[PDB]
Design a protein around this ligand. Structure first.
Ligand SMILES: CC(C)CCC[C@@H](C)[C@H]1CC[C@H]2[C@@H]3CC=C4C[C@@H](O)CC[C@]4(C)[C@H]3CC[C@]12C
Ligand SMILES: CC(C)CCC[C@@H](C)[C@H]1CC[C@H]2[C@@H]3CC=C4C[C@@H](O)CC[C@]4(C)[C@H]3CC[C@]12C
Ligand SMILES: OC[C@H]1O[C@H](O[C@H]2[C@H](O)[C@@H](O)[C@H](O)O[C@@H]2CO)[C@H](O)[C@@H](O)[C@@H]1O
Ligand SMILES: NCCc1ccc(Cl)c(Cl)c1
Ligand SMILES: [Cl-]
Ligand code: NA
Ligand code: NA
Ligand code: NA
Lengths: 219, 214, 534
């Protein structure tokens, strides 16, 4: 029924400006109040702003006050947030949330759209396949790996065999070191599976226009 | 602003047990205006309890809440693994609207030792002039684990990237990846590289090594 | 920006309860039940209360608290074209002062006359009595009771006046009583809601003390249950008649008192985030509840008269001042410790009037204060002059034909003049200011929008059940007459000029401000259809 979808957002340099949008459907949009809640990379929820049903009553947190402008369109059912003079502490995942009743809280949330405020340049990742030591004792199962190194900004998409095998897979969240993210992933399979069959590492980093596959070989 | 502090920060529970987490406001919050939200890993928050006592649609009866003034709490009568999440309270009494610092609820289970794997630098990275050694530590409990790196017999503490997963939704364990990064030159000045892991499950550290000889 | 607030929350509630609970909760409501067939009258009453009365009661309190201004400035900022609504509604409350206050004067008069071992209205052998005096009420109109002849031939001296054209001399013990009333009203509203808010702790609460005493004393009387029978005995044949629903409608609107600008002014002193929805519901209930209770108070005694006094219920069951100043004192006189019941009864009647009067006058003061800054700093001097005007004109009420003056205003000054103003109040908010924008206002205040049930009532139900009922009242119209006396039609014309002078302010200020603004015609409408700072 009710679906909130946040769009816009991405990398912006400090002092820069960006406009966020939220598409609402499944309810009368003009009847409810809307708010923006953001979540920092430290996973802390912080309320940004509120707009009333007719947009005639606005409230801001002292953090974003005067820099941020929350707008509303009841005709096309679109919520807007216009940011300017952006700073690094504004980096977060921004959420579109309803609604009207103060005593019932926020009953619906969007998927969220990520804003990264940084002066770091977008760079493409270097993916490496991880082949175990040779020759060694091979048990029932064997563990392979994929190393995605030196990229920015987030996210990246890593799947195995185009998403075929989802089992025994561990994809470790990225860690930022000196403005570069490094991500690794491990997958375990029976030694009868490999290298009897093909294991490829699929990596996608849309920011840099990067689509790469890596087959892991014992060589 | 009205600051909501939640305790504890992290909480571990066996299924079937009961948990309580508390929410304390600096100023006073009207009972009608305080709510709770549940957020599972990688997902948006969901409204859970509103006006302190009232379960949101879809919320199982094992959940309950109470409080008034500056002190509130959320209670799960019998915990399920389905209930593992982070819980944020909120006050709508006045602007600016504030959220609690949150309580992360994780499942506990029988202790498990990690399976340690060690991966030498790929031959593709070596052409680029970089060399990085990756060590995996998978499916262990509890979360705390300690990694060590020895370039020959000697501990190297510099240039390491450690990463933890979140708790697994099925087997309820944790996993960790440690990456040691070197220059190609510095890498080839040595042979035997060693990844080592000290976990609660053993007084003896699990060791994985390789040499450039093989 | 800067405005005072009620010193405490309770002040507001008692000010609203006090204003809303008036003498008509006592004489008129129980009579309507008895005439309309008892508990069967609760149905149209409850229905019109639910759809018509409480929503509009709710609406004013919301508007008042939100726009934070008196009745005139409120509608000016809301719908600049309709600003006349605030003018119409305020000077209605102005007209009511010229009559309603004399009811409190009569109460104090019977109070000052109640210090004695033997109540003067008991017997027929006094100097003001005629040969036709009977001990208690009856059918034949040429023969009155000892209480009736005491009220008419002694207190009022209405027998000395041939009509409203002849007022006769001035009665100074009445003028003194009326003066006392305006002194009480002055030193209450003199310094504003600071003193006013705490004063109503008495005037609102005290009648409930007396009610309980008179309820127990009334129910322990022989034949009290016989009265309760006549009061509540359901007859559902009366539901089908048209003017019953008209009666249920007009009572609910006068009782809750929207459309006098009183609820607006009182709410204007509320803090923005106060919950006015809980207040409107609470107050509405208390008012009707008081009416229901007072019914037993009246009819338990009305039964006692029928059973032990050898009179028939049809003759002692009355509305208006006839009930409180004649019939009810008649019964009190008979029962033991008569002097005590009489004293608290007439004191109750006074405190029922006062808190209502306060609201009417405060509605005028607050409205004029917000329009003209010169009045607010000068407020004590203004209200002094205002009541000075009231007392001087009110001397006409203290004459020997004074009742004829009273009865004239009691009809035309208010009533369906109030209905067309309230009609426009709903139409202006819903169809011009808009229901969506109004609901949004309330959400900002109390945290949640009105249920769609309230929106429908403001937009559809109330205007219809006003318009239809206010029309059926014009059809059942008959020229004003009191007893055997028929008012001249020049008197009826004066009443319409009074009733009309308010209502005509809706198109007046509308046409005036319309021609006064620049541009073509349809940006006029927009300019005057735009809210204050929007
Ligand atoms: C005779 C005395 C004692 C009682 C009078 C009855 C009154 C108070 C009752 C009877 C019917 C009631 C209404 C029934 C319908 C609703 C809809 C609900 O969403 C709000 C309350 C409201 C508007 C009620 C208000 C109170 C009400 C008007
Ligand atoms: C006469 C008998 C039958 C009934 C008596 C009615 C009395 C007890 C009722 C009627 C009106 C009521 C008051 C209405 C106003 C308020 C303000 C509120 O914030 C506290 C309760 C208080 C103070 C109520 C107390 C009880 C009250 C005084
Ligand atoms: O019958 C009541 C009392 O009437 C008179 O007292 C009057 C007085 O004449 C009048 O000027 C004054 O203002 O009011 C009182 C009470 O109404 C008698 O003089 C008393 O003896 C009677 O008891
Ligand atoms: N609450 C009855 C309505 C009413 C009673 C008295 C006055 Cl003075 C007014 Cl304005 C209105
Ligand atoms: Cl009533
Ligand atoms: Na908590
Ligand atoms: Na009333
Ligand atoms: Na009153």
């Amino acid at each position: 029924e009710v679906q909130l979808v946040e769009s816009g957002g991405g990398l912006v340099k400090p002092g820069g400006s960006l406009k966020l949008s939220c598409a609402a459907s499944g309810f009368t949009f003009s009847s409810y109040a809307m708010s923006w809640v953001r979540q920092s990379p430290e996973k802390r929820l912080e309320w940004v702003a509120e707009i009333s049903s007719g947009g005639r009553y606005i409230y801001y947190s002292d953090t974003v006050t005067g820099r941020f402008t929350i707008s509303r369109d009841n005709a096309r059912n679109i919520l807007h947030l216009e940011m300017s003079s952006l700073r690094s502490e504004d980096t977060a995942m921004y959420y579109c949330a309803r609604g009207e009743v103060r005593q019932r809280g926020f009953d619906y949330w969007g998927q969220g759209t990520t804003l990264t405020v940084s002066s770091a340049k977008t760079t493409a990742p270097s993916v490496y396949p991880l082949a175990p030591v040779c020759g060694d004792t091979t048990g029932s199962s064997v563990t392979l790996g994929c190393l995605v190194k030196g990229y920015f900004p987030e996210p990246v998409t890593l799947t195995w065999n185009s998403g075929s095998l989802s089992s025994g897979v561990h994809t470790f969240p990225a860690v930022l070191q000196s403005d570069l993210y490094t991500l690794s992933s491990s997958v375990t399979v029976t030694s009868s599976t490999w290298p009897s069959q093909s294991i490829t590492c699929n990596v996608a980093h849309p920011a840099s226009s990067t689509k790469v596959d890596k087959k892991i070989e014992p060589r | 602003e009205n600051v909501l502090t939640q305790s504890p920060a992290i909480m571990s529970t066996s299924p079937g047990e009961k948990v309580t987490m508390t929410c304390r406001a600096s100023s006073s919050v009207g009972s009608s205006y305080l709510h709770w939200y549940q957020q599972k890993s990688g997902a948006s928050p969901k409204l859970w309890i509103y006006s302190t006592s009232n379960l949101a649609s879809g919320v199982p009866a094992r959940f309950s809440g109470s409080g008034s003034g500056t002190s509130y709490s959320l209670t799960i009568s019998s915990v399920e693994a389905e209930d593992a999440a982070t819980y944020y309270c909120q006050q709508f009494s006045g602007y600016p609207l504030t959220f609690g610092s949150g309580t992360k609820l994780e499942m506990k289970r029988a202790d498990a030792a990690p399976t340690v794997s060690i991966f030498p630098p790929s031959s593709e990275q070596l052409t680029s002039g970089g060399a990085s050694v990756v060590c995996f530590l998978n499916n262990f409990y509890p979360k705390d684990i300690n990694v060590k790196w020895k370039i020959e017999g000697s501990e190297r503490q510099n240039g390491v990237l450690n990463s933890w997963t979140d708790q697994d939704s099925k087997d309820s364990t944790y996993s960790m990846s440690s990456t040691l990064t070197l220059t190609k030159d510095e890498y080839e000045r040595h042979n035997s590289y060693t990844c080592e892991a000290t976990h609660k499950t053993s007084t003896s550290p699990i060791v994985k090594s390789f040499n450039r000889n093989e | 920006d800067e405005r005072e607030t009620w010193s405490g929350k309770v002040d507001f509630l008692l000010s609203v309860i006090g204003f809303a609970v008036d003498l008509a909760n006592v004489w008129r409501f129980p009579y309507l039940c008895y005439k309309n067939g008892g508990g069967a009258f609760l149905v149209p009453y409850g229905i019109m209360l639910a759809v018509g009365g409480i929503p509009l009661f709710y609406m004013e309190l919301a508007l008042g608290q939100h726009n934070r201004k008196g009745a005139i400035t409120c509608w000016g900022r809301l719908v600049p074209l309709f600003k006349g609504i605030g003018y119409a509604v305020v000077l209605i409350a102005f007209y009511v002062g010229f009559y309603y206050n004399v009811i409190i004067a009569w109460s104090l008069r019977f109070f000052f006359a109640s210090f004695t071992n033997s109540l003067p209205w008991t017997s027929c052998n006094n100097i003001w009595n005629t040969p036709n005096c009977r001990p208690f009420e009856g059918h034949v109109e040429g023969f009155q009771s000892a209480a009736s002849e005491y009220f008419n031939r002694y207190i009022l001296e209405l027998n000395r006046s041939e009509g409203i054209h002849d007022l006769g001399a001035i009665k100074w013990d009445m003028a003194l009583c009326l003066l006392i009333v305006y002194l009480i009203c002055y030193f209450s509203l003199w310094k504003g809601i600071s003193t006013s808010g705490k004063v109503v702790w008495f005037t609102a609460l005290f009648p409930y003390a007396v009610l309980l005493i008179l309820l127990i004393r009334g129910l322990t009387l022989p034949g009290s249950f016989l009265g309760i029978q006549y009061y509540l005995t359901p007859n559902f044949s009366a539901i089908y008649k048209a003017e019953v629903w008209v009666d249920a409608a007009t009572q609910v609107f006068f009782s809750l008192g929207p459309g006098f600008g009183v609820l607006l002014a009182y709410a204007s002193y509320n803090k923005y985030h106060n919950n006015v929805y809980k207040d409107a519901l609470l107050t509405s209930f208390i008012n009707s509840a008081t009416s229901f209770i007072a019914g037993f108070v009246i009819f338990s005694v009305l039964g006692y008269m029928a059973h032990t006094l050898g009179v028939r219920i049809e003759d002692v069951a009355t509305e208006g001042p006839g009930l409180v100043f004649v019939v009810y004192p008649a019964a009190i006189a008979t029962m033991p410790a008569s002097t005590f019941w009489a004293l608290i009864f007439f004191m109750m009647l006074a405190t029922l009037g006062l808190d209502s009067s306060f609201g009417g006058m405060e509605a005028i003061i607050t409205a004029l204060s917000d329009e003209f800054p010169k009045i607010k700093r000068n407020r004590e001097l203004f209200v002094a002059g205002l009541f000075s005007l009231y007392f001087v004109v009110g001397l006409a009420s203290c004459t020997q034909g004074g009742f004829y003056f009273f009865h004239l205003l009691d009809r035309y000054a208010a009533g369906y003049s109030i209905l067309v103003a309230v009609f426009f109040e709903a139409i202006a908010v819903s169809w011009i200011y808009g229901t969506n924008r109004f609901s949004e206002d309330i959400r900002d205040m109390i945290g949640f929008p009105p249920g769609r049930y309230w929106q429908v009532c403001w937009r559809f139900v109330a205007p219809i059940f006003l318009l239809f009922i206010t029309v059926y009242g014009l059809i059942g119209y008959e020229p004003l007459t009191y007893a055997d006396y028929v008012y001249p039609s020049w008197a009826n014309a004066l009443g319409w000029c009074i009733a009309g002078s308010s209502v005509v302010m809706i198109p007046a200020v509308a046409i005036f401000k319309l021609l006064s603004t620049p541009g073509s015609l349809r940006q006029r409408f927009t300019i005057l259809t735009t809210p204050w700072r929007d």
